Design a protein around this ligand. Structure first.
Ligand SMILES: Nc1nc2c(ncn2[C@@H]2O[C@H](COP(=O)(O)OP(=O)(O)OP(=O)(O)O)[C@@H](O)[C@H]2O)c(=O)[nH]1
Ligand SMILES: [Mg+2]
Lengths: 1041, 171, 272
């Protein structure tokens, strides 16, 4: 019979206490356990007493209980019988009192405690001021007698603190937070007075520490005199930091304090730094090796180290012009500045990230002093030259060391991700913004600054590194890769002429290095570095073409290299060099008669026969960029034809054979081929851009008829076998042609100098071929990329295509709506895409919407409400901007606007309010507020026509105030008419400051989740009544000018 | 040889997709929000035998919360997660951490930027700084491409076993 | 211009040390690791053809993916590659043969275990499929062939054969290897035809003599493909992976130098 829901009876405990142990211990049954306990949150908690009192896995079971109790308090509290409010009050206070000081509560985990304490914080968040006045006052004394009730009380104070200062944004209404602040502020002294007491006199370890920690969270808000007009900082440095355990809380505190703005407290900061350091030098010496002490140090010292990373970095970063204005601190900051360097050798690409935050800050600051080199020459008298700028003169020696750092620990410049597309495709996938690349760039920046401040020093350094690789026998792959990456970073940070000398030197000795080494594991990695380095300096390959050629030809050579990835190396390199040095490839260079491209094309097959699929593609992009240069339309055309001559032959063949038999376009190989032939065609078009039409035209119609073929060959299959056909070789393949086809069409329309023509030539064939077909496909076969390709091919044409949004929007609009209009799940693509498409026709084609059946247009709005009701943040957000947009696009047509309001206006306000008071869509916040806001603004004037219909004495302003209030009251019966009046009037007050309006929205979201009830009037009814006035008395100090 | 890893983050974060990738090498493109929790065992094989993370795949949405903290009880490690494409979801991180350590005084934990693959990222690695002072590991992951895909697990593993040079293996 | 010491200096930059590689253009068009001496080396190459290698073991390994000059331990560099033909052999009349090779991709076809698979000179799988080659439809009876795959003809033109129904032909002189082709390829059921278990036709590449008259007539032929260039096998060469001066390649011309308002009209033409 093991399935019991919980109704009334003399309801037992030995049972529930079994379901708990289930959910937390065993297996799949746990599903029904967990699924049942979620449900005992219905009627209420008359059991709370029942369980908590009568407690093996009790403490869990009690836990749960407390959960219920807490729901009760967070909400019902207000309309509770006042006496029962008291009953909880003393129930909890007492429960804690006992649960603390226990001859064993380490066992009765810090859990039950902390959630209990946590509850008490919850209660306090309700009455603490008005109905618990002796509270703080009392518990002070309550600790000074007993340590047990104290240690823990430090924790009550902690959570209270977070809850009222940290996490009060959202979890509390706007004004009640103000009232709890200047309330904790109020009687904070009697309790700081407490923590000190402890620190100065108590010897009980755990107590002391939980006070450090509770102090740590006080430091976010407590008034500054408590920090600086107090011997606090002194207590921490002299008394707590030097001490193994508190070692850390001590620092983190320090750190926090070191983070304020010195204005009035410079003296305190000076002594805090020097003192801290007396401590630190005493502790972690400066002759100590931080690298090991970390690698070998356990978690005891791991964090200490990372928090030094933070105290250091944040302080140096926020008190610098403080750490030089006295010849006396100069030596201390050096000590500290030296710590930073030690810490920076730490193998931990997260500590090192903090370290590099400073490093880069310094670099920037000393780049803003002087971005120039200390004019190199001594003076004719011999004297010092005086051109070293005031500050770096102070870090010279140490910037030498940070340069060493960047060029040593230089980070991986690129992030290649081998990983196979959703087509069974295996590819290389170049990432754009990853914490990785961020490491790279920040190091690059620091070495670019530190290069402008003395590039003679970078050169010098990077040569001692490279030397130490050739002979120097610091040789290792990793380190060579790091040397050349840092070489590739500092490109263009060097006077050209300077860097000519430089490169020639650098790589010359790397060709020398590459001969030296025996092998081919080494010969290759070397080589690769030579090729990054070299391709990193196109300024160079442009002033030195004999060399460009030489590097390109070498490139080609490596393009038959059968050693690992040497080939990928070569192609990347070539495409870099092609984009950058792209011009020299199509013009005649001193030294030969006919343009290099020619030879290249006249040799395509022999260069690229040992490449595999992708490699050849990248090659075609490669020569794309070259053909994109030649601007001479005649030659560019001849060139584009001979450039697309190889693939075109494949294509032309497959296309003869498909006349004779439209079956070969079902042939697994010939589709493998229409695929690769297209991927080529797409890269090509990418590098080549608009003139590529010459090619595209050539196949566009036929391409279309094959896209259309494959499409009907897939739906078919699918219609007769299930979406399951999709997970097999040939369907995947065909799909691929369709996709790469649409990626070809969007690809090319995306970058065209002409709209008119494209709209008049390449658009109408889409209609039947690609659009209507999408309609005719079976749902689970319709290609989503059609929608998004349409979307792209509307932003590029705009007005020109606005006359056809009828025809398109027919093929696709409804048929696709019906796929997205059951739930908010199936078809995620279609959802997102379809909506980018609607977004865009709306944007660049609103006239359309204007010229269609009111029933249709209606149908379009509806779908938009449908967007922003979505739980996927993109569909709903995209839906929102389509809304805010569309409101404004309405604004222009004075004609259509008015009626638009007379039908949809209120009928939009219902939907938006709906979402706003929905707990799910909270990334809307700024959009909801934005829109709602703009609409009420709008009301106060723009809506020139009567909605109520009782003439003008029911003018619109007041109407709306009214229907909004009614709408919300009825959806939320608990709210007293007061909470509502307040809010709604705040919709026309906070009207123009949407940061403020957003504030408001949340204010209300809190009000509904909690039963404010009759009696309670702690919602400062009036306080804010005038508060919104200050908002209204600015909208006309600004918007009347 | 096993452990309990609570998996927290807000709605649509990609918590569910993440673990499921991990459990089948499937990728789910559909958003269906977990209601309450749903613990999935997982296994990796390593330098030192096998290991199993008991992934308490918790919910994100307030609507469907469940027994939240109630699931964190007896947690031995964790993973707050967020979506680098919606700034909002990093702003709630602090709250998740909160509830978490209010149950687990010291348990190895990991923070995960997800969606690193959408080339319109709105949480600049510049902006991610939280873990630092709360002393959690951080990782850039995508469940759509397996960028730094198993970092989160390999790390925790190294921590719970007390072995820095513990590398995963094929078998 | 001192950088000209790099232009020359980037010149000397080599991954290989294969003499007269066909990666780079013919050792005439530039002016390091390349001499005028094809003929010398050919000699000691032959004069050292007393098997030391377990080629039999190898065919297995290849054909089964099990891995315990030198034998190339995986799928890259299993093909015997041509060095540019430079030293035009004293004895070309009756001691060399020539394959007019077509345009496409070289490939090691390795058909075993019920499958067939083409690789590039660099152990990269470029197709997997079903053939009528012994081991590649459907017994420890594999096949290994050296082929150019012509995309426009979906044909794998075979060049040479190193293994067949489980017996290494590496130990064998080319005039044989090739006979074995032409004697055994056109005798497989349908290998040279397109079907549902042989999607790709396999066609043996003809060879001819290098006698003055020959090269003559051979240069005016019609072929079933597009001419890439010409291969030269010393009649008596065994099969050794990687560059060997015993196979000289040359492009078709070099020879007689070497001792001589809308889009457009829709193909397909179906609905609008
Ligand atoms: N681009 C991209 N999309 C992702 C990635 N991970 C997940 N998604 C998408 O994100 C959504 C996944 O939802 P969930 O994994 O359930 O996220 P969740 O709401 O926190 O998980 P549950 O509530 O437990 O079900 C789907 O839309 C996936 O298509 C990713 O790494 N990259
Ligand atoms: Mg969720």
């Amino acid at each position: 019979a093991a399935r019991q829901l919980l109704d009334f009876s003399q309801k037992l405990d030995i049972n529930l206490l079994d379901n708990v142990v289930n959910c937390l211990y065993h297996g799949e049954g746990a599903q029904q356990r967990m699924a049942q306990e979620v449900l005992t949150h219905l009627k209420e908690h008359p059991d709370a007493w029942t369980r908590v009192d009568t407690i093996s896995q009790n403490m869990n079971t009690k836990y749960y209980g407390l959960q219920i109790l807490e729901n009760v308090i967070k909400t019902r509290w207000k309309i509770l019988p006042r006496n029962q409010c008291e009953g909880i009050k003393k129930y909890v206070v007492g429960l804690i009192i006992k649960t603390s000081s226990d001859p064993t509560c380490v066992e009765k985990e810090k859990v039950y405690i902390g959630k209990l304490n946590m509850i008490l914080v919850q209660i306090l968040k309700q009455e603490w001021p008005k109905h618990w006045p002796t509270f703080i006052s009392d518990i002070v004394g309550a600790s000074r007698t007993s340590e047990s009730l104290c240690q823990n009380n430090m924790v009550i104070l902690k959570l209270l603190s977070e809850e009222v200062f940290d996490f009060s944004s959202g979890q509390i209404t706007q004004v009640k937070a103000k009232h709890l602040k200047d309330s904790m502020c109020n009687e904070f002294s009697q309790i700081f007075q407490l923590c000190q007491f402890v620190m100065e006199n108590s010897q009980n370890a755990p107590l002391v520490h939980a006070t450090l920690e509770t102090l740590l969270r006080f430091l976010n808000w407590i008034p500054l005199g408590y920090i600086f007009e107090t011997k606090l900082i002194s207590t921490l440095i002299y008394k707590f930091l030097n001490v193994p355990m508190f070692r850390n809380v001590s620092l983190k505190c320090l750190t926090e304090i070191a983070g304020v703005s010195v204005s009035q407290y410079e003296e305190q900061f000076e002594t805090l730094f020097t003192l801290t350091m007396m401590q630190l030098k005493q502790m972690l010496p400066l002759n100590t090796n931080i690298r090991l002490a970390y690698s070998n140090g356990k978690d005891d010292e791991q964090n200490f180290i990372q928090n030094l990373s933070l105290f250091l970095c944040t302080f140096l970063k926020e008190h610098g012009q403080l750490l030089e204005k006295r010849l006396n601190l100069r030596e201390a900051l050096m000590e500290a500045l030296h710590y930073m360097l030690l810490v920076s050798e730490v193998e931990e690409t997260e500590i090192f990230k903090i370290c590099l935050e400073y490093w880069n800050h310094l670099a920037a600051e000393l780049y803003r002093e002087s971005p120039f080199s200390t004019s190199a020459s001594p003076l004719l008298s011999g004297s010092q030259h005086f051109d070293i700028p005031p500050r770096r003169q102070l870090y010279l020696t140490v910037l030498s060391k940070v340069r060493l750092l960047m060029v040593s620990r230089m980070a991986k410049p690129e992030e290649v991700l081998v990983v196979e597309n959703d087509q069974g495709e295996v590819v290389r996938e170049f990432m754009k913004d990853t914490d990785s690349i961020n490491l790279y760039k920040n190091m690059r920046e620091t070495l670019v600054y530190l290069t402008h401040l003395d590039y003679v020093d970078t050169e010098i350094i990077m040569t001692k590194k490279l030397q130490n690789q050739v002979n120097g026998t610091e040789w290792s792959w990793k380190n060579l890769n790091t040397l050349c990456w840092a070489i590739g970073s500092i490109s263009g940070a060097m006077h050209e002429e300077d860097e000519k000398r430089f490169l020639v030197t650098v790589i010359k000795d790397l060709l020398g290095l590459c001969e030296q080494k025996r092998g081919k594991d080494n010969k290759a990695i070397i080589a690769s570095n030579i090729m990054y380095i070299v391709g990193q300096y196109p300024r160079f390959l442009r002033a030195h073409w004999k060399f460009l050629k030489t590097v390109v030809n070498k490139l080609f050579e490596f393009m038959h290299e059968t050693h690992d990835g040497v080939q990928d190396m070569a192609c990347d390199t070539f495409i870099k060099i092609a984009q950058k040095c792209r011009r020299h490839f199509v013009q005649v260079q001193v030294g030969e008669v006919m343009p290099f491209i020619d030879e290249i094309l006249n040799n395509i097959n022999t260069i690229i026969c040992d490449l595999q699929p992708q490699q050849v593609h990248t090659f075609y992009e490669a020569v794309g960029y070259m053909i994109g240069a030649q601007t001479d339309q005649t030659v560019q055309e001849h060139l584009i034809e001979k450039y697309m001559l190889l693939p075109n032959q494949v294509w032309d063949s497959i296309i003869q054979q498909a006349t004779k038999n439209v079956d070969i376009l079902k042939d697994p190989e010939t589709v493998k081929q229409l695929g690769s032939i297209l991927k080529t065609n797409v890269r090509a078009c990418k590098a080549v851009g608009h003139p590529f039409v010459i090619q595209l035209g050539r196949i566009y119609l036929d391409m279309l008829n094959v896209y259309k073929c494959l499409s009907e060959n897939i739906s078919a299959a699918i219609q007769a076998n299930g979406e399951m056909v999709t997970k097999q070789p040939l369907i995947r393949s065909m799909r691929t042609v369709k996709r790469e086809t649409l990626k070809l069409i969007s690809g090319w329309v995306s970058r065209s100098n002409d709209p008119q023509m494209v709209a008049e030539n390449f658009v109408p064939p889409l209609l039947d071929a690609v659009l209507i077909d999408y309609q005719r496909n079976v749902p689970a076969a319709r290609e989503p990329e059609v929608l998004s390709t349409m979307a792209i091919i509307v932003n590029k044409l705009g007005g020109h295509i606005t006359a056809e949004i009828p025809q398109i929007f027919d093929a696709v609009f409804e048929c696709t709506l019906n796929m997205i209009n059951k739930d908010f799940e199936e078809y995620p693509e279609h959802r997102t895409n379809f909506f980018l498409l609607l977004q865009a026709v709306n944007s660049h084609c609103f006239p359309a919407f204007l010229a269609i059946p009111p029933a249709q247009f209606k149908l379009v709005l509806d779908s938009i409400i449908w967007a922003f009701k979505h739980t996927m943040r993109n569909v709903a957000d995209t839906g929102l901007q389509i809304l805010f947009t569309l409101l404004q696009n309405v604004a222009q047509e004075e004609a259509a606007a008015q009626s638009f309001y007379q039908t949809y206006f209120c009928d939009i306000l219902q939907h938006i309010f709906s979402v706003v008071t929905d707990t799910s869509h909270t990334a809307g916040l700024t959009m909801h507020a934005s829109i709602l806001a703009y609409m009420f603004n709008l009301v106060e004037e723009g809506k020139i026509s009567t909605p109520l219909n009782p003439g003008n004495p029911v003018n619109n302003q007041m109407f709306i105030q009214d229907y909004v209030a009614n709408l919300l009251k009825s959806a939320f019966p608990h709210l007293q008419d007061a909470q509502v009046k307040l809010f709604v009037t705040g919709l026309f007050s906070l009207n123009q400051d949407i940061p403020a309006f957003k504030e408001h929205l949340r204010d209300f979201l809190v009000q509904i989740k909690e039963f404010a009830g009759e009696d309670t009037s702690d919602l400062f009814l009036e306080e804010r009544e005038t508060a919104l006035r200050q908002a209204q008395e600015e909208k006309h100090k600004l918007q009347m000018s | 040889v096993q452990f309990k890893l609570v998996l927290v983050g807000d709605g649509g974060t990609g918590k569910t997709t993440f673990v499921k990738r991990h459990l089948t090498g499937e990728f789910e493109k559909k958003y269906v929000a977990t209601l309450g929790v749903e613990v999935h065992p997982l296994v990796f094989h390593t330098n030192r035998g096998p290991i199993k993370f008991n992934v308490w795949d918790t919910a994100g949405l307030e609507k469907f919360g469940g027994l939240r903290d109630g699931y964190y009880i007896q947690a031995q490690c964790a993973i707050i997660m967020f979506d680098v494409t919606s700034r909002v979801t990093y702003k709630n991180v602090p709250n998740w951490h909160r509830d978490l350590v209010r149950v687990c005084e010291n348990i190895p934990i990991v923070l995960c930027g997800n969606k690193v693959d959408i080339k319109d990222r709105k949480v600049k690695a510049k902006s991610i700084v939280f873990h630092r002072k709360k002393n959690l590991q951080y990782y850039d992951i995508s469940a759509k491409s397996n960028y730094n895909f198993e970092k989160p697990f390999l790390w925790l593993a190294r921590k719970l076993i007390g072995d820095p040079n513990l590398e995963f293996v094929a078998m | 211009g001192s950088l000209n010491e790099l232009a020359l200096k980037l010149a000397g930059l080599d991954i290989s040390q294969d003499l007269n590689s066909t990666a780079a253009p013919h050792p005439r068009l530039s002016q390091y690791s390349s001499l005028e001496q094809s003929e010398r080396r050919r000699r000691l190459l032959e004069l050292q053809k007393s098997k030391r290698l377990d080629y039999v073991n190898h065919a297995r390994r290849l054909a089964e993916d099990d891995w315990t000059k030198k034998l190339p331990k995986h799928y890259a560099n299993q093909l015997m590659l041509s060095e540019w033909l430079i030293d035009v052999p004293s004895d070309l009349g009756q001691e060399w043969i020539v394959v007019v090779c077509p345009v496409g991709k070289r490939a090691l076809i390795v058909a075993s275990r019920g499958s067939t698979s083409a690789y590039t000179k660099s152990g990269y799988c470029v197709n997997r499929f079903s053939s009528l080659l012994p081991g590649g439809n459907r017994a420890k009876d594999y096949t290994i062939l050296d082929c150019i795959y012509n995309e426009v003809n979906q044909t794998y033109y075979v060049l040479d054969v190193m293994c067949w129904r489980g017996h290494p032909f590496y130990d064998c002189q080319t005039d044989f290897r090739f006979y074995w082709m032409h004697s055994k390829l056109p005798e497989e059921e349908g290998l040279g035809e397109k079907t549902k278990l042989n999607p790709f036709k396999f066609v043996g590449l003809k060879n001819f003599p290098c006698t003055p008259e020959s090269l003559c007539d051979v240069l005016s032929m019609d072929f079933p493909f597009e001419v890439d260039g010409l291969l030269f096998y010393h009649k008596q060469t065994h099969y050794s992976p990687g560059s060997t001066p015993l196979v000289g390649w040359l492009r078709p011309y070099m020879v007689s130098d070497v001792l001589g308002h809308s889009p457009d009209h829709p193909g397909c033409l179906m609905e609008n």
